[PDB]
Design a protein that fits this description.
Three copies of one chain form a homotrimer.
Chain A (H helix, E strand, L loop, with lengths): L2 E5 L4 E12 L1 E10 L9 H23 L23 H10 L4 H8 L5 E5 L5 E9 H8 L10 H22 L4 E2 L9 H9 L5 H8 L2 H6 L2 E8 L2 E10 L2 E11 L2 E2 L10 E4 L3 E6 L2 E5 L6 E3 L2 E5 L4 E3 L5 H4 L9 E4 L6 E4 L3 E6 L5 E5 L3 E5 L3 E6 L5 E4 L2 E4 L6 E5 L17 E5 H13 L2
Parallel strand pairs in A: 1-25, 2-15, 3-5
Antiparallel strand pairs in A: 1-2, 2-9, 3-8, 4-5, 6-7, 7-8, 9-12, 10-11, 11-17, 12-13, 13-16, 14-15, 17-26, 18-19, 19-22, 20-21, 20-23, 23-24
Helix pairs in contact in A: 1-5
Subcellular location (chains A, B, C): Host Golgi apparatus membrane; Host cell membrane; Virion membrane
Family (chains A, B, C): Belongs to the paramyxoviruses fusion glycoprotein family.
Membrane topology (chains A, B, C): Single-pass membrane protein; Single-pass type I membrane protein
Amino acid sequence: NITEEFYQSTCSAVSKGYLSALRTGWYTSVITIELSNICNGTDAKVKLIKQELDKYKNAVTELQLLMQSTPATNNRAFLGFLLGVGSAIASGVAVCKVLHLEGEVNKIKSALLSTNKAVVSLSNGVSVLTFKVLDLKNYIDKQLLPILCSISNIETVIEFQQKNNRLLEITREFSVNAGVTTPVSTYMLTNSELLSLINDMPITNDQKKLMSNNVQIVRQQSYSIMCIIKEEVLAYVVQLPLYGVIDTPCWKLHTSPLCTTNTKEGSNICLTRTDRGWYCDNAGSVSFFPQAETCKVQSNRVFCDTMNSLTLPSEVNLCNVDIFNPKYDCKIMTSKADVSSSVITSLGAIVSCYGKTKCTASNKNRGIIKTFSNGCDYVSNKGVDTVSVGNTLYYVNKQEGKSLYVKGEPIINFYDPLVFPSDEFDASISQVNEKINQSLAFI
Amino acid sequence: NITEEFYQSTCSAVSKGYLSALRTGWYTSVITIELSNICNGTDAKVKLIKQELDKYKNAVTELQLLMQSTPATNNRAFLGFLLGVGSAIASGVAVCKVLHLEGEVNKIKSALLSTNKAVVSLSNGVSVLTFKVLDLKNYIDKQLLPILCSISNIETVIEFQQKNNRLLEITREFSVNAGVTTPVSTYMLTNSELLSLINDMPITNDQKKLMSNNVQIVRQQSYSIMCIIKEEVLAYVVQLPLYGVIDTPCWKLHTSPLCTTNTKEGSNICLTRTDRGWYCDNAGSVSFFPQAETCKVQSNRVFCDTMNSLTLPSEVNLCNVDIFNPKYDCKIMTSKADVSSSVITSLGAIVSCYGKTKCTASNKNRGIIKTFSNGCDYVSNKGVDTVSVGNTLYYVNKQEGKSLYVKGEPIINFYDPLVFPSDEFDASISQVNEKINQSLAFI
Amino acid sequence: NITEEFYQSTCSAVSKGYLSALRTGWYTSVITIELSNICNGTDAKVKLIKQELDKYKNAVTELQLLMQSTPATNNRAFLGFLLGVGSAIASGVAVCKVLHLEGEVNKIKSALLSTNKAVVSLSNGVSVLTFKVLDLKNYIDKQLLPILCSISNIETVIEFQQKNNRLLEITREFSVNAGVTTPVSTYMLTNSELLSLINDMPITNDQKKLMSNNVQIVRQQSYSIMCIIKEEVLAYVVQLPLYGVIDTPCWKLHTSPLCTTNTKEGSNICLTRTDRGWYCDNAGSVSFFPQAETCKVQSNRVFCDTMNSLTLPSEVNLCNVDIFNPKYDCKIMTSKADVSSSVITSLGAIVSCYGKTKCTASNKNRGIIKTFSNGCDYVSNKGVDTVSVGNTLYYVNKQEGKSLYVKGEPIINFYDPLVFPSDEFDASISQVNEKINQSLAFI
């Protein structure tokens, strides 16, 4: 049930009706691959086995050389620049540091001796879920040891290339990613293995249901950290998202520049709401994501990460209805740049048409059905297939939903251009007023 | 025929002589893969077939689970922040919504019964080109049904792994991309299939010739949208670029900070043209791409996307010759940051040398051939292989082309530092003048 | 030996003790693959060979069509916007332009006739290291020519698919990357081939030791440029990083907003150091990388690229101890945005808590151990596992290292809010003072 409201006064539109799925924590699991510890015959079948065995030996050496250092990563030091700075794999690397302590790998090696899935409590007190997805030790020792110059058939050559291929592909991913990959591919964790991992995960039924129906999103929000390879065990930590906030209301705020509508070049002043992005109710406050491109939207579900959010008071919503309200200082930016553009919303299109720009909305069967005059306007996606602003053609989202046009006078008309602070990049309503008050008194 | 002109007055250079190739629209095609609808024997050849058949069954289940939701995507809400906001796959998803209407898949399934390529007119009136690239139904039913515990040979095991591998790789791409991939890989569409798709495409001969000679660029500007999988048919929409603007003049404007040349720290004022990027003539106006990194340049051809552009009047070119012209208010930024840097142009290098920085240009055989003094200067790529500014070594483009040094006094000398607005991030020539006029009157 | 110091006065922390590894130049090598120049029988083994041979012929045609144009690339025109603009593959493309000169490929073809590794001096005077990694000519001519309708076995079908697979994968990478790939995958250059290339490279023993122990980082800083395919030779240039600066001191400066601590909404003023990023001593100056995410950190080693750096005087370090020092004008930004956030450092966490935000630091075994009051504070990673600011949970880095809390009064208390320039995006200490001095005199 997606609806949309356009606010003509502030040149902004809100698309509400979405449900939340916020990454609040991390789950660390240890995926393992049991390894094997290892002829004059020129047999064309043994030669193919010797070649595949060298690929196995090189991949093990390649991963050992890769891990002689700590898991490498890159970290930092409209309003996205106001965000904090985290360490995404800090939790996964912490689990990996524990696996280097002596005897810790033996605990994992022993727990997975009789089964392939087991919960292990590490030395530092963390209870991780362990998973042995490939047992190359069992295959090489039971099917490739008696052959080494002995009897060889082609069905073993094919089967060994099939099982070893997963190890080769995992090494290829880590070799070009410095031991940290995201999203987590199907070589690191197949769709059946990941689903089985989610089912055995200590989470609520709603979290299992949510993650199982969106495994492709879980992959995109998961990390695979190459960890340790000792004592015939190849272990890499898979860091999975914890969705501590589920099914709370979300809405996407779209904003576009609001300018005066003089055809004369350079005689206009503008005003743009800078608080655009995804908003979701979260624990009394509002989780504001200033860069909506960091969130994934599956149907009416919104997948975001709280690391890319700010925690704002719920009074920030008043900027949609009353941008001049005294409870919250609404963030805006001021510019003299009267350029034309359009913002494709969930159920329509905002059109900021200025200067001498041709702005239209068209249907594919009929052609132009509306011609926008100068100013900031809006059209619903019902009956409209494309929007053109200048030489840019926009396709609108053809999703079902009702739009509401909230009429109101553009607030840019309430400012005297002679004393309007034309170049404020990160300002607010009160901030602009303060500058206007000073410029007035001195006149 | 690439030429270049450096404007000493404004610390900017224009590289002209390029030809346009602008993405103006989209073409949606439906690529299909016909699927098959499906033993005590422990035969080492049947066992390999059973394993590959499970890979086939899992990939189908994995793609069915992936598509139970609408095609997921991420969208927004120097001057790149002035751009609009579109929905890249809005047109492709619209085609996919039609394929879910009942009987629509049967139209595609029937049209591709006797051939592999066919044009189908959908129910909503859109005429799409359909393509059956893989018929696993025909292979499993004619070569793998009588075997199921029957006679098995190794040549069938190898051939089934070859044909099924494309389905497995397509699933791997969609599993780590949430059903939307770009660029379109060769598993989604081989080079011969894409070229055949371009040839059967309803476009002019110039568009066919352009796309065929730059298929790698077309891939980078194309989307692959996993759509529907029902009634033994696996369909995904390939969204291809429409180049409605071809062979119009383009030019790249490079800008660098222009500062006063006092060695004393912090006593300088700067000025930087913010209108840098790719410019292309387009339908009476000028398509300005403020982030030149969004365009691909093959030889003298420039591939851009109008979604990443602004539509400006052609008078914006006057800022290169006369930044003070009254017809267009040229965009600049003002700073006190007198740091040294270089901008590698198409046929040379702009050098902004300030403070106590060592700035040189060298030849690989001889060494330093020029030492830059403080200010903004330029050197041609003829005879010059590298440029050094501080501890940063720049390699220059060794492309053939003539450069022109347009002498002129730096416009930063025309401003009195005592009343110069030192911190304007998104300003213009007129905007700075306005602020100077006010500060003067109050003195 | 990583240590950290937090500066309460300026809301910033420095993590020192790292060692440098700066990309200062490029090394260009020519990797080659010798190609072969090429039946009514329906044999199920010849049919599999005919199919794999068509994959070989199509890949060669696909790469020939890809290279009919010059190697395509995309280039430009907190303080990262102050950086210069280079051409990353300018040096590699220059080597490729030489390979198109007639007779140049024959020099490479002749040098690799009796060996697989050879140093060749090109016509323009550049001495490149050449490497023949795959000889498909020798395999097709000696193992697949007598078969073409003749005797065929399955071991040849498997071996031809193995050798040809590397050519097919290299083509797949170039087809979706327009002939330029980074990082350099293991198909372009295997781990053993790259290590052998580093060993035969004309570099010092320290550079060989550094690159060999961090091959995954070298891959991420290397380019693979598809170059020429003529006269049975497929050549692509691998552009490798030259680390001209090794083992010099580095340190990472983390900054966070410093605001006044009034609970009242919108009554605070802030101040944020904008000079955050990686700093490394380099040749008398300091290489400043304003976007720390461009550097890779392996253990205590920092891998950066001087193309993403500014060359600053060493006096910039005084901003950590005395932001008001007269030797360097420290860069800051001023805002009224009193939002709460945290910055995860190497050995702790900076917490900027403002408004009505809940900011805590917790241990996994015990829970909340510290509750932050309004202002900018810091906690060490010793005994602390997580930090919460609002609805955002941060995991801290669990690396061993001592932190030092340098007490001092926040410099934001030294400003009178009535005359404080609230919206300076790219300002400095002196710049703010200048604006304050003017606003005072007019009062």
